[PDB]
Structures are given as C-alpha cells and as structure tokens.
Amino acid sequence: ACPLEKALDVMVSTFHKYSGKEGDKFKLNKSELKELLTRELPSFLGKRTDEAAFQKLMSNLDSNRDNEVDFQEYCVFLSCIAMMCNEFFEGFP
Amino acid sequence: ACPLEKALDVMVSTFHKYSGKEGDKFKLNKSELKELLTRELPSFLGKRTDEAAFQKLMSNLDSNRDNEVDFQEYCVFLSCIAMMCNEFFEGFP
Numbered sequence A, B: 001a002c003p004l005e006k007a008l009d010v011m012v013s014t015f016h017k018y019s020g021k022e023g024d025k026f027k028l029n030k031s032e033l034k035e036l037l038t039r040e041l042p043s044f045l046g047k048r049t050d051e052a053a054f055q056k057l058m059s060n061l062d063s064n065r066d067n068e069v070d071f072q073e074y075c076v077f078l079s080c081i082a083m084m085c086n087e088f089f090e091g092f093p
Ligand SMILES: CN1CCN(CCCN2c3ccccc3Sc3ccc(C(F)(F)F)cc32)CC1
Pocket: A041, A042, A043, A044, A045, A081, A084, A085, A086, A088, A089, B001, B005, B006, B008, B009, B012
C-alpha cells in the first residue's frame, strides 16, 4: 500500500527495461533512449519526435560524454522533470 | 497508461501532501518529514526508529541547514534511494 515506494520501483525498473536491450546492459544508447522516451514519457516528448530533437536530448543528458545515458544521468533527467512539476504546485512564482 | 509519468506524479505530489500542513507550505519541517517517511517510505525507515537516526536523516536531507527539506532536497533523497535500488539490478559489484 505504498504509492511512493511503487513509484521508485517503476522509475528504476523502467530504466532497465530498455537499458538491457543492446550493448552495455546498464546504459541507454540512442536507440534505447528513444524507445524509453517515446513509450514511457510521451507527454514530455509530445508532438516533437524528429531526429534533431533526440540529438539535443542525448546531448543534454550525456554529461560525461561517453555517448550513453547511465543511471545517474537518467536520475538527473527525471529530477529535472520533477522540478518542472513542482513549479505547478508553487503557483508558478 | 504511462507508469513512469504516473510515478513522477506520485513523487512530486507526495511531497506536497505533507509540505503544506505547517509553516512554510513548500517545505517539510522535522514533523512533516517524519510523517512522510513513516507513512510513505516505511520499508526505508523500519519500525521503532530512535531520534539520533532521524536527526541524522534530517541533517543529511537538509543540505542548506535551514532546518527544513525543500523540494530540491527531497529530489536528492529520492534519487539516492533510486541509486541504491539500481545496485540490485547492477552487479552490486
Ligand atoms: C494523461 N494525462 C496527460 C497529462 N499529464 C500531466 C502532464 C503534466 N504533468 C504534471 C504537471 C504538474 C504536476 C504534476 C504533473 S505529473 C507529470 C509527470 C510527467 C510529466 C512529463 F510528461 F512531462 F513527463 C508531466 C506531468 C497527466 C496524465
């Protein structure tokens, strides 16, 4: 009966649902990242799903520049979205 | 529909379910933090937790030392739980 614990469970497991598909099992390459965003975050991705848009995502997220998104970098991304949601509650000051 | 967007929703909404009970409406005080842990993260806390341990947790989450957990501080905490979880999927080395 813990919604917040289930929500941490989904956030972590979803990462691995896609990261294990190709190459490094614990990181998202471009293709695995595209699947995750398109399937799991379509409200974020929204209308725009063109190739130069995923390029910028990869560039924003891949801060250590190994060409993949690891778990820490994915957490930073989810936490950026969480911050944007929080602004709604803070009344958009 | 989208478990990951629903998870983000729960992460962000649970903070505000407790933050707005007392004083600063956007921050958890020591008492609003205890209620959130106790009620929403019971596997993390365990049962019968002493004040030394709680105080440890508070000062750990409270990086700016103002005696409250703000949303940015709460995201660091969750992302640290998440990374502990991620170790299960990874080797644990
Ligand atoms: C089906 N229905 C479509 C729209 N969403 C809400 C979208 C906005 N949203 C949001 C905004 C303020 C506070 C909480 C939330 S939950 C949430 C989670 C992820 C995303 C995202 F997408 F950015 F990652 C957007 C949102 C609710 C579900």
